[PDB]
Amino acid sequence: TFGGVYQECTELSGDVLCQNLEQKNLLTGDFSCPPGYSPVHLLSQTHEEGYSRLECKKKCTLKIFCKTVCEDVFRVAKAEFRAYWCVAAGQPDNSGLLFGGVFTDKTINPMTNAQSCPAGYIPLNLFESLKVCVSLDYELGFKFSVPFGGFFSCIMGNPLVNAPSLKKCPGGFSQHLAVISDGCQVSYCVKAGIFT
């Protein structure tokens, strides 16, 4: 079962960037997993954004000679985001989240053949631009849902494959690339054959 995703954020350059990066877990209201689920660290990265401002300053040589020089000063704003997903550490079986596919600002969600979530699904923000479609209404949301077999990234394996984590999809699941974040692959597992 799939327990949701979350993404923490930390400001390392005294700025304001986390507003877009952090994402709380639906089921807990916090950056944590529900009871019976364990966090699986997908990725840790530093998001950088260039901010250039022009500044003029008065410089005086000996106090009698006043000269105003105008330089634009370039600065970089940095914040670290840490993206995790929640996996069933044990086994309440009637819990978790339904999976309705993922997409980015540049890719499409094959479930809808558009950059959107299925009807009645919530997009959860992950990384810089990834969206994970999730529903909690089983009887209404199940119609648009596909079985989910886990995530794995270039730095963390998929704990659902059956010791360390292996970057593979389990059983009858196939791997599909979710996003490339700063040169690191992040893919997900769904049922084999569903996508065409």
Author numbering: 377 to 467, 469 to 539, 548 to 581
What did the published study say regarding this structure?
Perforin-2 (MPEG1) is thought to enable the killing of invading microbes engulfed by macrophages and other phagocytes, forming pores in their membranes. Perforin-2 (PFN2) has recently been identified as a novel and critically important component of innate immunity conserved throughout the animal kingdom and evolutionarily close to the last common ancestor of the MAC and perforin-1 (7, 10). Because of the presence of a canonical MAC-perforin (MACPF) domain, PFN2 has been proposed to form functional pores in bacterial membranes, leading to bacterial death and control of infection. However, unlike MAC components and perforin-1, PFN2 is initially synthesized as a type I transmembrane protein and found associated with the membranes of intracellular vesicles in which its large ectodomain (consisting mainly of the MACPF domain and a unique P2 domain characteristic of PFN2) projects into the lumen.
We determined structures of the P2 domain in isolation by x-ray crystallography in two crystal forms, with two crystallographically distinct copies in space group P21 at 2.05 Å and eight copies in space group P1 at 3.17 Å. Truncating the β hairpin (residues Y427-V452) within the P2 domain (P2Δhairpin mutant) abolished its binding to PS, cardiolipin, and E. coli lipids, confirming the role of this region in membrane binding by PFN2. Thus, membrane binding seems to be conferred exclusively by the tip region of the P2 domain β hairpin. The P2 domain helps to stabilize the pre-pore state by swapping between monomers and enables PFN2 to bind its targeted membrane.
